[PDB]
Design an enzyme around this catalytic site. Structure first.
Site, short mmCIF file in Angstrom:
data_model
loop_
_atom_site.label_atom_id
_atom_site.label_comp_id
_atom_site.label_asym_id
_atom_site.label_seq_id
_atom_site.Cartn_x
_atom_site.Cartn_y
_atom_site.Cartn_z
N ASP D 19 0.78 -1.23 0.00
CA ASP D 19 0.00 0.00 0.00
C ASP D 19 0.81 1.29 0.00
O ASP D 19 0.24 2.38 0.03
CB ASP D 19 -0.98 0.02 1.18
CG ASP D 19 -2.41 -0.22 0.74
OD1 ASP D 19 -2.68 -1.25 0.09
OD2 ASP D 19 -3.27 0.64 1.05
N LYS D 22 3.71 1.26 -4.85
CA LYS D 22 4.49 0.67 -5.94
C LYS D 22 3.75 0.66 -7.28
O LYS D 22 4.29 1.08 -8.30
CB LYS D 22 4.90 -0.76 -5.60
CG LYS D 22 5.76 -0.88 -4.35
CD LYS D 22 6.13 -2.33 -4.04
CE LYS D 22 4.92 -3.17 -3.65
NZ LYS D 22 4.27 -2.69 -2.40
N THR D 23 2.52 0.16 -7.28
CA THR D 23 1.73 0.08 -8.50
C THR D 23 1.27 1.43 -9.04
O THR D 23 1.19 1.61 -10.26
CB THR D 23 0.51 -0.84 -8.28
OG1 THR D 23 0.98 -2.12 -7.84
CG2 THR D 23 -0.27 -1.02 -9.58
N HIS D 58 3.82 -9.33 -1.96
CA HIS D 58 3.23 -10.15 -0.91
C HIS D 58 4.04 -11.41 -0.61
O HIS D 58 4.83 -11.86 -1.44
CB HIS D 58 1.81 -10.51 -1.31
CG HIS D 58 1.03 -9.35 -1.86
ND1 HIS D 58 0.87 -8.17 -1.18
CD2 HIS D 58 0.40 -9.19 -3.05
CE1 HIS D 58 0.17 -7.33 -1.91
NE2 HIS D 58 -0.13 -7.93 -3.06
N1 LIG Z 1 -2.80 9.95 -1.05
C1 LIG Z 1 -2.08 9.13 -1.83
N2 LIG Z 1 -2.50 7.87 -2.05
C2 LIG Z 1 -1.65 7.18 -2.86
C3 LIG Z 1 -0.47 7.61 -3.43
N3 LIG Z 1 0.11 6.59 -4.18
C4 LIG Z 1 -0.71 5.59 -4.06
N4 LIG Z 1 -1.81 5.87 -3.28
C5 LIG Z 1 -2.93 4.99 -2.98
O1 LIG Z 1 -2.66 4.05 -1.96
C6 LIG Z 1 -3.23 2.76 -2.32
C7 LIG Z 1 -2.18 1.71 -2.57
O2 LIG Z 1 -1.48 1.97 -3.80
P1 LIG Z 1 -0.70 0.85 -4.61
O3 LIG Z 1 0.10 1.51 -5.67
O4 LIG Z 1 -1.63 -0.23 -5.00
O5 LIG Z 1 0.29 0.27 -3.46
P2 LIG Z 1 1.27 -1.00 -3.53
O6 LIG Z 1 0.69 -2.09 -2.71
O7 LIG Z 1 2.61 -0.59 -3.04
O8 LIG Z 1 1.38 -1.39 -4.96
C8 LIG Z 1 -4.21 3.05 -3.45
O9 LIG Z 1 -5.51 3.34 -2.99
C9 LIG Z 1 -3.59 4.26 -4.16
O10 LIG Z 1 -4.55 5.11 -4.76
C10 LIG Z 1 -0.04 8.95 -3.20
O11 LIG Z 1 0.96 9.52 -3.65
N5 LIG Z 1 -0.92 9.65 -2.37
#
Ligand SMILES: Nc1nc2c(ncn2[C@@H]2O[C@H](COP(=O)(O)OP(=O)(O)O)[C@@H](O)[C@H]2O)c(=O)[nH]1
Ligand SMILES: C/C=C\C=C\[C@@H]1O[C@](O)([C@H](CC)C(=O)NC/C=C/C=C(\C)[C@@H](OC)[C@@H](C)[C@@H]2O[C@H](/C=C/C=C/C=C(\C)C(=O)c3c(O)ccn(C)c3=O)[C@H](O)[C@@H]2O)[C@H](O)[C@H](O)C1(C)C
Ligand SMILES: N[C@H](C=O)Cc1ccccc1
Lengths: 99, 83, 208, 378
Positions: D19, D22-23, D58
């Site tokens: 979260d 990364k994505t 994960h």
């Molecule tokens: N406020 C905010 N939310 C973000 C940001 N980058 C990602 N998110 C959010 O945080 C959540 C997780 O993002 P994701 O890229 O899937 O995380 P991952 O598990 O590292 O791949 C999602 O709901 C995204 O919209 C950012 O710069 N700011």
RNA sequence: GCGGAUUUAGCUCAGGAGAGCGCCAGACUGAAGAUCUGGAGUCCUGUGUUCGAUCCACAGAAUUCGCACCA
RNA sequence: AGCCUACGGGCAGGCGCCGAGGGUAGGGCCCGUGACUGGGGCGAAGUCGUAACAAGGUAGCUGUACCGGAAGGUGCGGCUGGA
RNA sequence: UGGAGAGUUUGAUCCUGGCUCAGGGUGAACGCUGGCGGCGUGCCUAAGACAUGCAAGUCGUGCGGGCCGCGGGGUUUUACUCCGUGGUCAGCGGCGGACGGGUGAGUAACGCGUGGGUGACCUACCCGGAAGAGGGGGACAACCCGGGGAAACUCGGGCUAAUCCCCCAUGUGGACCCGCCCCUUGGGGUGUGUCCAAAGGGCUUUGCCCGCUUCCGGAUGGGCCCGCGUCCCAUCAGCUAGUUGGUGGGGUAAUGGCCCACCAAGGCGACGACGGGUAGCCGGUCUGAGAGGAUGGCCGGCCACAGGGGCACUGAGACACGGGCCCCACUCCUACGGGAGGCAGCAGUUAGGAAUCUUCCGCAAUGGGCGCAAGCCUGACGGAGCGACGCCGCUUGGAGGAAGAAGCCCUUCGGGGUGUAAACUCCUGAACCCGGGACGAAACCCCCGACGAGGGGACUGACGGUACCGGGGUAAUAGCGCCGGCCAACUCCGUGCCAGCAGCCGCGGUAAUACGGAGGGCGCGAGCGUUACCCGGAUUCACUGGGCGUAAAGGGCGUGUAGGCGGCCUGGGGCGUCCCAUGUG
């Protein structure tokens, strides 16, 4: 997708619509004839029956009726006329048929 | 229409045609109407070309456009020369 | 092909001494001359009466081994021979003798059929001018079979034709030792051949 | 569609706690660069062409992270400014170290959620220290602060947004610049015999089977004969019918390129992950070998008990892991953590092996040893 | 690849490693059988927890079923 | 009622027969599967008795009929492949 | 120009009888193994489903334009943009798209095969012969104008050219009704009456070339019809309403309930109707001494089909695989408003299965379509690639070398075997290296003659810098099955009715030639085995060529229908039968 041969179809249609016509004329025109022999007429019948002929041999020129179909239509058409005027009338009017 | 043409035979890398008359429509190596000669475009034999003329003469007298290269050989075997 | 491996190991078994090496198979040691018995841990033990089949077999294997030719090739000839009109028995041999490798042996150029092959294969031989390397090749009557120009000076082909000076050869042949080039007179008739074999058995065997 | 090689190629990817972004960052990177140049994506800067793998990160994807990180020339560590380093930040860093990721660039994400300058500096300090803890040059790595989400949303609004026009998008360019500069372009072994470990195998509907992976050395092109080595009962030989870069026809693939190699007459039942495609006769399949192995200390995440004869841990070679039976020399009952020794191994399945090939030893999800093949026995 | 199920005497199968069976051997036989005598695991692997592990925990393996996407 | 005409006529459109298939109904033929049930085949040394082969220890067999744990028994009649 | 038999029921025997082995064959597959090349050959299963690319067009010497790029002045100039020519995109119009290529689903049928019929018929382009082309008229694309859609693509409006459509003329001829003569299913001729023709374009232009029209003949390609031949079950026995025939029509190129009225009640079946099952047919192929038995893969011929079903149109020819319409199933696309597709073409994917290939090069040759030609197209074809799948050729060496290394196996402890095998010595020299380098290709085209006959000139090669020739040149892969009998090849150890083998007979219970390893041997060899299937042996469905007293087999007996078979003599016919010739094959 498509490969230009449709023209054949295009042409097909046209060509069809084309002879479909003349062909019916033959009919309507033919019936008209017999209808006057059956009605025991005389000249008018022949005049028609005569016109009939022509319209047919004409259809034979194109890709419509041909071979014997040509004659067949006549060999019968005027074949009946005579066999309808032999009911008194008599070919009083010099038409296609000959005494 | 009817034609006078060649039909492949022999093996691979070794042509050996057969001067023949068939209906255009039949396939190349199809069923001929009548043979009239053979031709080996390599002259492995001293007798590579050969054509029964009387026959080839007939099939023409009745109309039968031969392949351009069917003419060649025919001609070459002196089919048309009339003196 | 051409077997490869122990031979004066058959100069045995078959019992009947056959020449596969040539030169040595004359020494006081074809091993047959030293061991009159079949090879192996047993060999020299009271031997049971061979079955009417073993015979028809062992004869065939003999003749065949003589020319060192594959069953496949062998067989094919036989059939062809069984096919060609006339006395199949004889015929066979003819075709079996017409093999270039064979000829080149009888014509002396080679000290043994096995060696013959090699030579024929390596192009050291030729026919009616053009050269050939088809051991299998069946020579027709009237063919000139000679050594190739490049080969004419081979230390071996020499030593070979050397001894040929003097000795006569196959009535159906004609060797011109000088220009070292023989000819093929005609297909030999049985009388002409003389191998330790009864062609009949072979015939029989192939009806098994 | 064809792919023309014009800039040096580099492989990178995103790691970091769940979260943290990364994505979202991966998507932002493709949109931002797309404005200039018209889970595995590509994008290029004025300097290089990049292939980027976005690691789900994960626990159940551990084996995939291993092969993904192993093929990275550098990794982008994403850390949320609102949360700071978390367990996976630490876990991914150790894995990156153990598989040899050469460089790390940090992207402090979600700064749109944190403004307090002190909290931001604290997070950076913590990340730098964490990196130092696993021996990465924490005090030297670039640490870019930004928001992957705001940058992505801006590109969605204006796909043509260019550098200098939006503060958030510009933060992505700061990262792209840092990647261009801090992560050096490695020397590719293009002159050695072709070798590509198979990552995955698919069937391109109506085209045949395709094997993907990163070329380790050499080159490959349509018409090339290649051997499929390892895992299966016998080595298979076929001919390359296609080579693609991100689904685009490629003239010839070279070491460093992560491509798709379409193979002739081979079903997805004849090629699989773990096998390697290689120039015929360049490498062979084996099961028994000798190797010099270092048993990790408990202080390095390994076990406190040593190795023993009969031990059957998993041996990680390139893109796969195979069970192997350990056999210690006569007299030696155990090899303790922290020691270096040479012992024999017999894998339960054949693997393309060669002297000098490095491999890791893991028992379940724990790294317990690092070895190098020293002699092939069979 | 993601997940579940499965993996204890020769055979069948259940926190202080068992039941049943037959099974193995000896005696007897010219033999086999029948009778009499007698005897009898690493619980998939490793490590850990525990006074003690088939049993609990972690890692792994294998079998199996469903899911998986598509250069 | 429309469209075209060189006034004969053509097209459009209307109606009908034929009609793929679709529905409902009632049949025919074959395959699979079914609680249970009937026998049959085969499987080193389990039970019960002794029918048959020597008058097989009541000659045997056989169609039929009844009957009995089982082979089988017996009645009528038949045959010799029994005396 | 051809035929062989053996093992197994018994204490032993002969007989009967089944089983089994030895041979040949296959579009094979599976195991262990695997070096080179040529020519062949490769989804037998789901006629299941398909991504992508390519597979049918071609004519400016038929017509008028759009767009693009050259050359040149009529009024006194830009404008109505009038003309000759060389690109490109469609349109019109012509010819081809009905061949070629793919498949065996369906079909038990005049489908195929074979031999005939057509007085019951058609046949474009090509040949041969006869005969002609004089006048006007007509409207539709393209194009222009305005409009709807994501797309596929469509409606309304205004012009126009023809080898496009049309009428009148001319009618050698040809078509149709009636009558006559000839002939005999509607064939040939003839009399009156009626009816039907044409297209221009190009060059060396009152001279030809390419076309147009009509008719007769030829040639090729078909349609329809008939005799005989072509699968298993009778535990399928009775079947039938367009059903059988008829008069009159309709329909067609034409015969005919093919179809429709009206009428008559017939038509088929134990010589197997009807029904179920199964199947494409043949040339041939495999086996057999033959007669037969089995089979129909490659190639050739016929038929049939193009996701399933129906229907027409166009046309010389189709009910048309890459044309059309509709219904159904299925998959897909989408801007969710509608639309799209049909590999049983080449190659390739997936599914299934024991299993069956490259998304190759080229139109150089042959063959095909259009064109006057140059020439365009051609996954037809010609080549290449993949697999010991098959056939054939060939290599892993040759000659020497011990009264005989070592190692290993036997050993009556002397020795015997592997074994001239090796080592070792000489010579040859696959591979590899360098040099040269094809046949296949002579036409079409250009000049003379006449654009003909005859002669002369020129271009063109995918495979390929491959074959093949010449020079140099290294000893350079061997495996699989078997060894009790049949059936060729034996000893030791291990094991102990265990483990295991096994085509039939059978083997293993502590000295196993049968199991497992070994030494040795026999067989075949880049192969050797195994499983499957066909013929053989099997005179074991018996015509050749068998049988029934006890081996399986006489009906319980009789009467008699169909059917099968039939004494002696003389003569006629000549269907069977036999001979000759000829067509065919
Ligand atoms: N406020 C905010 N939310 C973000 C940001 N980058 C990602 N998110 C959010 O945080 C959540 C997780 O993002 P994701 O890229 O899937 O995380 P991952 O598990 O590292 O791949 C999602 O709901 C995204 O919209 C950012 O710069 N700011
Ligand atoms: C790592 C998985 C697979 C690797 C496979 C192969 O690895 C390789 O063979 C690789 C080559 C070396 C390999 O064998 N890696 C195999 C191994 C290689 C190991 C090295 C190098 C090392 O040196 C001893 C260094 C990291 C060294 O360790 C230190 C680490 C200390 C960690 C303490 C963690 C502890 C207490 C802990 O509780 C902890 C934690 O905090 C976080 C997460 N978890 C889960 C933990 O438990 C420090 O970071 C140093 O830098 C090659 O890379 C191959 O190409 C590849 C990738 C195929
Ligand atoms: N170029 C490869 C195909 O796109 C890289 C790749 C491999 C596997 C999966 C996604 C991407």
């Amino acid at each position: 997708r498509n490969l230009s041969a449709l023209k054949r179809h295009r042409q097909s249609l046209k060509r069809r619509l084309r002879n479909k016509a003349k062909k019916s004329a033959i009919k309507t025109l033919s019936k008209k004839a017999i209808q006057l022999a059956q009605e025991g007429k005389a000249e008018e019948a022949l005049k028609i029956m005569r016109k009939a002929e022509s319209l047919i041999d004409k259809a034979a020129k194109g890709s419509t009726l041909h071979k014997n179909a040509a004659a067949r239509r006549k060999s019968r058409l005027m074949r009946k006329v005579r066999q309808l005027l032999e009911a008194a009338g008599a070919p009083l009017i010099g038409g296609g048929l000959s005494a | 229409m009817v034609k006078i043409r060649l039909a492949r035979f022999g093996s691979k890398h070794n042509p050996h045609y057969r001067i023949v008359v068939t209906d255009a429509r039949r396939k190349r190596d199809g069923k001929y109407i009548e043979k009239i000669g053979y031709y080996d475009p390599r002259k492995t034999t001293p007798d590579w070309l050969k054509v029964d003329v009387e026959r080839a003469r007939y099939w023409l007298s009745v109309g039968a456009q031969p392949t351009d290269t069917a003419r060649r050989l025919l001609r070459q075997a002196g089919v048309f020369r009339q003196e | 092909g051409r077997y490869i491996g122990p031979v004066c190991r058959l100069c045995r078994r078959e019992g009947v001494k056959l020449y596969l090496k040539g030169e040595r198979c004359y020494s006081p040691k074809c091993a047959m001359e030293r061991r009159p018995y079949p090879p192996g841990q047993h060999g020299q033990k009271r031997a049971r009466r061979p079955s009417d089949y073993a015979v028809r077999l062992r004869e065939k294997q003999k003749l065949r081994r003589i020319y060192g030719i594959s069953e496949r090739q062998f067989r094919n000839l036989f059939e062809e021979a069984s096919k060609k009109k006339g006395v199949t028995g004889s015929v066979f041999l003819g075709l079996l003798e017409s093999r270039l490798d064979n000829v080149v042996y009888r014509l002396g150029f080679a000290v043994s059929r096995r060696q013959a092959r090699q030579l024929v294969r390596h192009g050291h031989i030729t026919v009616n001018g053009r050269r050939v390397d088809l051991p299998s090749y069946r020579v027709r009557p009237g063919d000139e079979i000679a050594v190739a120009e490049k080969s004419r000076n081979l230390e071996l082909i020499r030593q070979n034709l050397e001894a040929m000076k003097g000795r006569k050869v196959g009535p159906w042949l004609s060797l011109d030792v000088e220009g070292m080039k023989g000819k093929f007179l005609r297909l030999p008739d049985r009388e002409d051949l003389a191998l330790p074999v009864n062609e009949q058995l072979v015939i029989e065997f192939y009806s098994r | 569609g064809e792919f023309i090689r014009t800039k040096p190629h580099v492989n990178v990817g995103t790691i970091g706690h769940v979260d943290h972004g990364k994505t979202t960052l991966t998507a932002a990177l493709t949109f931002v660069t797309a404005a200039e140049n018209p889970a595995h994506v590509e994008y290029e800067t004025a300097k290089r062409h990049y292939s980027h793998v976005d690691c789900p990160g994960h626990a159940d994807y551990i084996k995939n992270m291993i092969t993904g990180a192993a093929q990275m020339d550098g990794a982008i560590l994403v850390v949320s400014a609102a949360d700071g380093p978390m367990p996976q930040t630490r876990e991914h860093i150790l894995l990156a170290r153990q598989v040899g990721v050469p460089y790390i660039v940090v992207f402090m994400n979600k700064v749109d959620m944190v403004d307090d300058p002190e909290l931001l500096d604290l997070v950076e300090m913590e990340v730098r220290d964490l990196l130092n803890q696993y021996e990465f040059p924490g005090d030297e790595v670039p640490v870019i602060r930004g928001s992957a989400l705001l940058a992505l949303e801006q590109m969605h609004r204006n796909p043509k947004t260019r550098r200098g026009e939006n503060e958030w998008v510009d933060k992505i360019w700061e990262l792209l610049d840092a990647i261009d500069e801090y992560i050096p372009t490695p020397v590719r072994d293009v002159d050695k015999p072709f070798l590509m470990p198979v990552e995955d195998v698919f069937t391109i509907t109506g085209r045949g089977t395709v094997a993907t992976g990163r070329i380790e050395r050499g080159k490959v092109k349509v018409g090339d004969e290649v051997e499929i080595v390892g895992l299966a009962p016998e080595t298979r030989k076929t001919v390359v019918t296609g080579v693609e870069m991100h689904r685009k026809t490629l003239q010839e693939g070279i070491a460093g390129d992560n491509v798709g190699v379409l193979l002739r007459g081979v079903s997805r039942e004849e090629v699989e992950r773990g096998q390697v495609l290689a120039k015929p006769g360049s490498i062979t399949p084996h099961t028994k070998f000798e190797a010099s192995v270092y048993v990790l200390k408990k202080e390095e995440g390994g076990r406190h008990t040593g190795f023993f004869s009969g031990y059957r841990p998993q041996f990680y070679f390139r893109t796969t892991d195979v069970t192997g039976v350990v056999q210690l020399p006569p007299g030696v009952e155990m090899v303790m953590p922290g020691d270096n020794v040479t012992f024999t191994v017999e894998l339960i399945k054949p693997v393309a092996l060669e002297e000098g090939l490095r491999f890791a030893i893991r028992e379940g999800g724990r790294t317990v040893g690092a070895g190098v093949v020293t002699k092939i026995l069979e």
